[PDB]
Paper text:
The temperate phage lambda, which infects the bacterium Escherichia coli, belongs to Siphoviridae. The virion of the lambda phage comprises an icosahedral head and a long flexible tail. The tail, which comprises the tail tube and tail tip, connects with the head through the neck. The neck–tail complex comprises a channel formed by stacked 12-fold and hexameric rings and a 3-fold symmetrical tip.
The adaptor ring, which is formed by 12 copies of [name], is assembled below the portal. A total of 65 residues (4–68) of the 68-residue adaptor protein [name] were resolved. The structure of [name] comprises 3 domains: a β-hairpin (residues 23–36), a two-α-helix bundle (residues 4–22 and 37–54), and an extended C-arm (residues 55–68). The assembly of the adaptor relies on hydrophobic interactions among the subunits of [name]. The interactions of the adjacent [name] subunits are further reinforced by interactions between the adjacent β-hairpin domains, which form a β-barrel. Compared with the NMR structure of a [name] monomer in solution, the β-hairpin in our [name] structure undergoes a 90° rotation, from parallel to vertical with respect to the two-α-helix bundle domain, which facilitates the formation of the β-barrel structure. The assembly of the adaptor on the portal mainly relies on the electrostatic interactions between the electropositive adaptor top and the electronegative portal bottom. In addition, the C-arm, which is absent from the NMR structure, interacts with residues 320–324 of the portal wing through β-sheet augmentation.
Residue numbers in the entry:
A (entry chain M), B (entry chain N), C (entry chain O), D (entry chain P), E (entry chain X): 4 to 68
F (entry chain L), G (entry chain K): 24 to 54
H (entry chain L): 217 to 301, 320 to 374
I (entry chain A): 268 to 301, 320 to 374
J (entry chain B): 321 to 374
Amino acid sequence: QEELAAARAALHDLMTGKRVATVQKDGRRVEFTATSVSDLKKYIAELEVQTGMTQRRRGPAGFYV
Amino acid sequence: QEELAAARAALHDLMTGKRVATVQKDGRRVEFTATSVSDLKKYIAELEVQTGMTQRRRGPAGFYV
Amino acid sequence: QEELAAARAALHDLMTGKRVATVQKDGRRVEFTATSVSDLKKYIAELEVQTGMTQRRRGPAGFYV
Amino acid sequence: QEELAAARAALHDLMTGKRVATVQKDGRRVEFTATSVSDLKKYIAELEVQTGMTQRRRGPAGFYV
Amino acid sequence: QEELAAARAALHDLMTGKRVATVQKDGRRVEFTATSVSDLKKYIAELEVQTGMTQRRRGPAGFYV
Amino acid sequence: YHGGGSGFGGQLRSWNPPSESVDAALLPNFT
Amino acid sequence: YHGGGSGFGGQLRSWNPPSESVDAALLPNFT
Amino acid sequence: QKWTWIPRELPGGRASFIHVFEPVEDGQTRGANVFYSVMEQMKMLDTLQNTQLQSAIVKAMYAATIESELDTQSAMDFILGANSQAAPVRLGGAKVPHLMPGDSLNLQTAQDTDNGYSVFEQSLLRYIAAGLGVSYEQLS
Amino acid sequence: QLQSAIVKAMYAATIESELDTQSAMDFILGANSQAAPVRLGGAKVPHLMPGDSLNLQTAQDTDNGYSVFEQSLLRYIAAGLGVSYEQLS
Amino acid sequence: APVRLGGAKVPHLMPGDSLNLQTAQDTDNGYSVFEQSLLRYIAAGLGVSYEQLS
């Protein structure tokens, strides 16, 4: 899905440090809200689970002697 | 419903980083209040439940030998 | 009641991000107080119970063998 | 009583988002104090109890087999 | 992967002190959000596990008499 | 006698078993 | 008699075992 | 099906059909079983016993919990110790895993398996023995 | 009391997650989708992401003082009827 | 809505959902001893022995 790629790019931008919080030029000025890293990670996880393009989670373990 | 699409778009904008908190241009200036991620997720979940177009929740599990 | 539609619209505006906190135009400037999501939800639910147009709550469950 | 109608209108204005905290126009500027929702609800409840125009509270329940 | 090098460089810049929060030049002004050290370290480690170019983690230890 | 009465606080108000023979109680649900 | 009845609060409403001989109960699942 | 008429006594006075039961009241055609007194309680106690046994089995099944952000196979490889050559884990030996900051290992604890069920069962069994007429020790 | 004990003993655990119910039960409980039954054979150790959570319920004492109150009421009843307490109870 | 008691159940809850199992106080929290004292007083008043009365 095209949401997953955008979310991954946003996570990479936030990690590297290229996420813009406020941009100003003379009179013009726009401010964007910021979100935590954990919420973005949860969003990406649930989005990739919905897509199902790979499988990264499995059932519980089992034991034997 | 037409709200669910708007709520989904708002969640995606907030996650990606395009939700705007303040807009200013010379004298004019408008500021919008901010909402939490969990509240928006709960709103989307209950709106999905009300619409009933899909089924994402089921009853409790059961065990056998 | 005409006090339910307004509350629903206010909740949707707050969720989507169109609720305005401050409005300014040169000298003129107005600022409005902000309220929490839980209080608005409680107000909406209680006003629904007052109106009685639908039934969303029922009594406790029962068990049988 | 005429206090109860004003209190109800103030509660509705606060819920919808039309309560004014600060208003300014050129040099002139006035700022009003803000109160919590719970205190307003308690005020309305006690005021409607004093009036007695309806009855919304009753005695404790009783049990039988 | 070409993300690992960028993350490593960002971590080194943050440690040394060359990570920039705001940049201003006369009217122009941009501000970037800041992230914690632990989140960046976790991102780097998890991306290393995804790449698999080396092996830095092993299974639990064992005991003998 | 409170045996035929309503009860302590009226708890036995709904307890009104019918007066019937043993056949009338047993035969309908014998099987 | 509440043996054939619905129960205390209706808990035994679904408890309706069939009336059958020992052969009808035993033979189908003997093996 | 078919029904046959069987007279109680032959014309000579011989007993043809025998019916033995103890009447309770004046007019009683057929007798009542002794289980009516305690029928409901026995069924409800059986349901309670089965539910308690299933609950104990369920609560005893989940021994531990793994929390991590890596792939599930990698998480069990690095923490639980399974071999990927979901994934079975060998019971031989004692293990001390190494956890990164994001990783976690939680050993679950369960409630007492028999938390007062014995006393309640004793009370119900005394009630049932009183209803049936046999002694409590013999029944339980 | 009997109904309450059965109800409280019935709910063994609780699953909390943001995923679908089928996915949550498959990944945490261990059910197979090939709601969802779970086989009781063996012991299991699930893996949980930060959002996921597993809670094992703890219930009150099954017989928390009911027996002594029953004893007092049975003594009162035996006194009323005239039979001995041991014979009645 | 009726609920069937057969089996054991493990529900799945969203963040907003919750399930709480109520705990109750001891059914007989010292009522027996107080009843014993009152019965001793009553038996003293009437004249019959405490064991016979209670």
